Amino acid sequence: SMTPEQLQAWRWEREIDERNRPLSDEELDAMFPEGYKVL
């Protein structure tokens, strides 16, 4: 059973899955102030 440090590694894993999760265009559009054109 996972020792304290490998639990940290496992948490880092979960954390980045959330930070690398695919974003909808709606999520994305809301991140932005006026005055930008989409290339």
Partner 1 sequence: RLPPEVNRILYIRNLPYKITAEEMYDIFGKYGPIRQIRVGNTPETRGTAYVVYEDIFDAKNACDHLSGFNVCNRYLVVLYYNANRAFQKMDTKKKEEQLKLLKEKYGINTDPPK
Q: Does 5 bind partner 1 (CB under 8 A)?
A: no
Of 18, 13, 38, 16, the closest CA to residue 28 belongs to 38
Q: Does 4 bind partner 1 (CB under 8 A)?
A: no
Return the amino acid letter for 15.
E
Which of residues 2 and 31 has its CB atom nearest to partner 1 in the complex? Answer: 31
> How many residues interact with partner 1 (rule CB under 8 A)?
17
Query: How many Cα atoms occupy the beta-carbon half-sphere of 10 within 13 Å?
Result: 7
Q: Which residues bind partner 1 (CB under 8 A)?
A: 12, 16, 19-20, 23, 27-28, 30-39
